[PDB]
Ligand binder design. Structure first.
Ligand SMILES: O=C(NO)c1ccc(Cn2nnnc2-c2cccs2)cc1
Ligand SMILES: [K+]
Ligand SMILES: [K+]
Ligand SMILES: [Zn+2]
Length: 357
């Protein structure tokens, strides 16, 4: 296919001024981008310009209060930045954080626009800070604004409010914010795979369990695939895609696919403890390309091992460009708790999705 790419070095300015070893490093996006040059993927992509989201566009999903408080950080002394971030769960703030969050969202809006107007079929967004933990009313988990959810609402806003958007969240953490923003919405299908461990894994809410299926009109349009019992990898993700993600996505018949593409389920990630390989990621991308006549935007969320994320996101771009997926030969048998996880999601969603029955 013809594949868009958006990257802006300005998104590197957002930094932890008290702890420069904090995993959500500026060089996350510079290394992913560099590795795209090194693999010469960049020359095969249509460069989409970055841009600031407007406060009007942020309001697609966030309150005035929340937009206003994060905007006020631009002009704070360090001791005020420190104390503002302590108001949230796992948030650091610098004078540049607002601008960077704006850049992450605008980059994704331009990418959605390039896709939906037919300038490209598919696109990768190399952006930070991440979005999926951000709520309507609060920052959380290194996230200021819900980039993915905003892009889903911005896409509906420049096309039609009916546009069926599938958000696949394969970041190792639950997109608490993405689930809540669309919980009562049957126009946005939210599928998250995430390490859960009975509430022990961040963000530590029962909201990420398989029995949270959506509310009212949204009942069945929220699919949590929670992993328990530690390490997971290619076999579990390939099994989850086959029995759940792809059957539900096919029934839903999305007109656009957003991937909340965290690479913290990657082998080597210090915060995920999982073993998804770049080849694994290449297979999940290729499978998603089978939907929405290939209309797929891949948006960076988390992922904290600089090699793993650079190798993993490059393999995804490579797939969007139409390259042949690496053999995933000799996959081991599934972990048991992963069979149980998949079967718990089937029992929860069979009532809503004939393709699972
Ligand atoms: O966005 C995230 N992943 O993609 C994310 C968000 C928040 C957390 C919180 N946490 N939990 N345990 N250690 C931590 C750390 C806090 C600061 C450095 S480590 C982990 C991960
Ligand atoms: K997830
Ligand atoms: K939903
Ligand atoms: Zn994560």
């Amino acid at each position: 296919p013809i594949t868009g790419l958006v990257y802006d070095q300005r998104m590197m300015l957002h930094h932890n001024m008290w702890d420069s070893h904090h995993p959500e490093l500026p060089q996350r996006i510079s290394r992913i981008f560099s590795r795209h040059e090194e693999l010469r993927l960049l020359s095969r992509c249509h460069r989409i310009p970055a841009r600031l989201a407007t406060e009007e566009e942020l309001a697609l999903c966030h309150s005035s209060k929340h937009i206003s408080i994060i905007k006020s950080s631009e002009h704070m002394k360090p001791r005020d930045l420190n104390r503002l971030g302590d108001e949230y769960n796992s948030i650091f703030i610098s004078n540049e954080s607002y601008t960077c969050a704006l850049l992450a969202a605008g980059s994704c809006f331009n990418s959605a626009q390039a896709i939906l107007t037919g300038q490209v079929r598919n696109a990768v967004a190399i952006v930070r800070p991440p979005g999926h933990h951000a709520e309507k009313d609060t920052a959380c988990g290194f996230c200021f604004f819900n980039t993915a959810a905003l892009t889903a609402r911005y896409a509906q806003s420049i096309t039609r409010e009916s546009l069926r958007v599938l958000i696949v969240d394969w970041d190792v953490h639950h997109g608490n914010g993405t689930q809540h923003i669309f919980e009562e919405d049957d126009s946005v299908l939210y599928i998250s795979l995430h390490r859960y461990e009975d509430g022990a894994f961040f963000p530590n809410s029962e909201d990420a369990n398989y029995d949270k299926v959506g509310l009212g009109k949204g009942r069945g349009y929220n699919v949590n695939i929670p992993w328990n019992g530690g390490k997971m990898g290619d076999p579990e993700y390939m099994a989850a895609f086959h029995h759940l993600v792809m059957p539900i996505a096919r029934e839903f018949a999305p007109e656009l696919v957003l991937v909340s593409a965290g690479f913290d389920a990657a082998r080597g990630d210090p915060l995920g403890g999982f073993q998804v390989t770049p080849e694994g990621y290449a297979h999940l991308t290729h499978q998603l390309m089978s939907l929405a006549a290939g209309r797929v935007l891949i948006i960076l969320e988390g992922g904290y091992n600089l090699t793993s994320i650079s190798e993993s996101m490059s393999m995804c771009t490579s797939m969007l460009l139409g390259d042949s997926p690496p053999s995933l030969d000799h996959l081991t048998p599934l972990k048991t708790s992963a069979t149980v996880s998949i079967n718990n999601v089937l029992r929860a969603h069979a009532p809503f999705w004939s393709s699972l029955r």
